[PDB]
């Protein structure tokens, strides 16, 4: 559910608020627990870390390990 991922990634970004770094590990752990990075996950990561959406989408699509669509 698109509402489950909201709180579920809230609990993954919790240990990282206000620590000056560690965004690619956040994305790594959202990839581990979802297999892909949905748009809702990225929007909530941006709203919690108060990092712009352009930055999180740029770093999410920079690496080949991540995926923006559900994988087979």
């Amino acid at each position: 559910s698109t509402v489950d991922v909201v709180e579920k990634v809230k609990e993954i970004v919790a240990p990282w608020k206000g620590k000056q770094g560690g965004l690619i590990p956040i994305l790594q752990e959202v990839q581990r627990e979802l297999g892909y990075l949905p748009e809702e996950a990225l929007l909530t990561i941006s709203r919690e870390l108060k990092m712009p959406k352009a930055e999180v989408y740029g770093v999410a699509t920079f690496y080949a390990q991540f995926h923006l669509k559900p994988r087979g």
Binding site: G21, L23, I24, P25, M51, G58, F62, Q65
Partner: protein, 425 residues
């Protein structure tokens, strides 16, 4: 066969997890004699005469980099260990972090003591879970014994390690891309003159180094410096881990001193090609490295000697080719790798790499003219001399080196339309 092992002088004659097995073989002694016997200055100057050049690929004297990092402003430093080995064939370094993480921990600690670094990072790809596991447990098993926590030996010296798991890119192995990747940004290299010793992680001075040069500072401290300078030629002193692979009988990691003729590497160490075939070429520096052939058989392998031969030393992978392999296809494969792992920041690389891939594809497919070869050569030279990061400056290496030694093999694709690879129409 017969080779000198310094970096991997532990291999399997050690337990990879429990530390007291490691200390039973002079494990942490260096740290003591550098933290309780010597001064934070002589430890730098006696490394500076050891001639330990950067084993990461550049070949820079680590003593000079440590001097640049120590003589910095402000009181906040860092030490970083680059184990984001992205070359598919350069498992050289993951094997070291999986064999003896404690020697690397010692090296990072010695660096922190000399430079004056409080914190420290290690960069490992999330694709290597074994090294990450063993290092995460080794740092704990080494701080419990009071070697990686606060007031080590009670000497006003603290050193914490934060293992950072890499994301997986190959451009993220450069200093600036690594620094950007730790800070949660894109691994896009930045201009060099603000070097990562006056301005690094979060603006604080850093001393990024490779893992095999980190695995050498411990031994050169304890066994001395005059001894380490007695295994080099005249400029490059020490050992070097090589990944001998390809169509060779004996494949794996070897440790030869520097200034070794390549013949011994392929004719008597691996024991010859993996059939009754003959030797055509050997790529020396992984994907972004040149390729040497039979005119280079008695040329010693150094940092300065390989450069004159168009081949760079980096990722240390020595992949050997049979007589059947074609150099046009070899160049295309090694350039299609560096294209996929390009950042897309500098015009020369973002464009010329794709264009050279197309030119090589049309020269191998028989649709090549006689001036597209000149176009390819000039494009290689332009991308080499204009690109920002070393990726763009060493990506058109397997084209320059395949044209300067196999020029007839290229011209044969334009004039007689047939290929000695015997694999394609």
């Amino acid at each position: 066969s017969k080779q000198h092992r310094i970096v991997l002088s532990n291999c399997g004659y050690i337990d990879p997890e429990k530390i007291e097995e490691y200390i039973a073989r002079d494990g942490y002694m260096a740290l003591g004699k550098a933290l309780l016997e010597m001064t934070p200055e002589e430890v730098l100057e006696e490394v500076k005469k050891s001639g330990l050049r950067g084993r990461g690929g550049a070949g820079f004297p680590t003593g000079l980099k440590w001097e640049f990092a120590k003589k910095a402003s402000g009181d906040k430093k860092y030490v970083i260990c680059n184990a984001d080995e992205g070359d598919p064939g350069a498992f050289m370094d993951r094997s070291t972090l999986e064999g003896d993480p404690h020697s690397v921990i010692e090296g990072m600690t010695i660096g922190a003591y000399v430079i004056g670094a409080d914190e420290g990072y290690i960069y490992c790809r999330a694709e290597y879970p074994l090294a990450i596991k063993r290092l995460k447990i080794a740092i704990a098993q080494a701080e419990e014994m009071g070697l990686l926590g606060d007031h080590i030996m009670g000497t006003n010296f603290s050193f914490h390690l934060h293992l950072k798991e890499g994301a997986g890119a190959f451009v993220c192995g450069e200093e600036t891309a690594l620094m950007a990747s730790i800070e949660g940004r894109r691994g896009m290299p930045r201009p060099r003159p603000p070097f990562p010793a006056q301005h690094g992680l979060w603006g604080k001075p850093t001393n990024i180094n490779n893992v095999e040069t980190w695995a050498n500072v411990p031994r050169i401290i304890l066994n001395g410096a005059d001894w380490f300078a007695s295994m080099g030629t005249e400029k490059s002193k020490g050992t070097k881990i090589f990944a001998l692979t390809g169509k060779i009988t004996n494949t794996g990691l070897i440790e030869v001193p520097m200034g070794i003729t390549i013949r011994e590497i392929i004719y008597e160490l691996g024991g010859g090609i993996l059939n009754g075939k003959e030797f055509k070429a050997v790529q020396i520096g992984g994907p972004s490295g040149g390729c040497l052939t039979k005119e280079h058989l008695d040329l010693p392998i150094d940092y300065e000697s390989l450069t004159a031969a168009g081949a760079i030393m980096g990722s240390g992978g020595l992949v050997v080719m049979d007589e059947d392999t074609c150099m046009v296809d070899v160049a295309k494969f090694f350039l299609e790798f560096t294209q996929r792992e390009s950042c897309g920041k500098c015009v020369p690389c973002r464009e010329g790499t794709k264009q050279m891939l197309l030119m090589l594809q049309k020269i191998c497919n028989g649709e090549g003219t006689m001036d597209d070869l000149s176009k390819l050569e000039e494009l290689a030279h332009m991308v080499k001399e204009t690109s920002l990061c070393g990726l763009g400056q060493t990506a058109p290496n397997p084209v320059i080196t395949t044209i300067r030694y196999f020029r007839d093999e290229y011209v044969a694709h334009i004039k007689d339309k047939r290929c000695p690879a015997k694999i394609c129409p």
